[PDB]
Amino acid sequence: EVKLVESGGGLVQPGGSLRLACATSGFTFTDYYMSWVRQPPGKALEWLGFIRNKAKGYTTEYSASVKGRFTISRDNSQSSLYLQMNTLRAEDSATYYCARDHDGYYERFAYWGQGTLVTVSAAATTPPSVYPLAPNSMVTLGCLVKGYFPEPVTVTWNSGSLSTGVHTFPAVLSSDLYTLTSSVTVPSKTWPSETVTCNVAHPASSTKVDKKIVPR
């Protein structure tokens, strides 16, 4: 299938630089224009620029908001797309996606990466503490994932094998540290008789934690 995958996202100091990369497969790379698009948390998509296909000789265009500060380039031998970002400021904090643009007929972004989150801040990387939230028909368990920076963190329950009845609440920032929690609801048949574990990852500190919810 068509696969687009951004990477390189993370914490960078205001005034600093960062380059993202976008790995693609499943289609003829040189045929396509490629675009970058960003979305600050909670806000609208914004188109940033593109680099044209072979026929048009891989020229680049930028939106006025990043022209002269961002550079796009591609590696056709590898089917890769890049974004060089410079003199970053807080307004640049956003999830950045690449998307498959024009092939010379269809006017459409048919395909999009999962996105990679960039945070522009002077605040330091801090790993989360992870705490078990333990207490009839249905029973509700949780994990409290507290004090981390920057975003994101992922939380799954039993390695992704518990999916429904999951609520992960949007982190809230206080004093330059985020906190979030996740809840899962399972029939008390299943618990504690059968284990429940939350798996928390914090890629900025490479943190991997499992917390078994044990009855008090």
């Binding site: 675009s35 698009v37 609208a44 998509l45 914004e46 188109w47 593109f50 265009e61 939106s63 996606y97 643009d101 024009h102 269809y106 006017e107 459409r108 972004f109 048919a110 999009w112 990466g113 999962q114 996105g115 503490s129 705490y131 078990p132 939230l133 333990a134 207490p135 509700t140 949780g142 409290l144 507290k146 609520h167 992960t168 609440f169 949007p170 982190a171 809230v172 206080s174 906190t179 979030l180 929690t181 809840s183 609801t185 008090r216």
Partner: protein
Amino acid sequence: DIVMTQSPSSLAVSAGEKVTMNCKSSQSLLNSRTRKNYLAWYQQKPGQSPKLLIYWASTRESGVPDRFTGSGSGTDFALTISSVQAEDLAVYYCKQSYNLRTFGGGTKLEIKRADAAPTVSIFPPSSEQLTSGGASVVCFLNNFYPKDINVKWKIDGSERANGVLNSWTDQDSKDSTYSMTSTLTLTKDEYERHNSYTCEASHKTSTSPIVKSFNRNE
């Protein structure tokens, strides 16, 4: 400058109803040559990447349910959902590609459903957190409607407002409910000074608060 604007900024619609959302360009997006309007519609569900629904104004991307219809021409465009389903919850963006590309500001579509009262549970601080010197007490208010809800924390029967952070999830793609977390954070020393820890949930589905409590004498 091609300026793209969308309206309404947000709206709520019950399942089965019609939804119309509009997209306005500041200059025509009709390539007089080809007679195609360079306007696409995208759908971004909560937590996901945007996804293509329509291009060239009215051409429906394969895989996209037929209840979605793009229409319009020149500077005015609409996306109409003939019969909304619970999974259609999302922000919808239009995007011109006539001169480079520019997204509109988006229309956030919420689902209206019947009122539903919240399921509340409370959790004491973990021994791991306490021994490190903090105490967070957590209430989940799960699967309710509408979104507006109030929680008050009572410690030994009295109200406390300092230290409480709330966070609502995006609406659920399946049942159209919200859920919210309320977290009260104390130091170990203050947590150890009291016994009754009470989370009270006030929602329009009842005149009577839903109250979940635990006493620190475990």
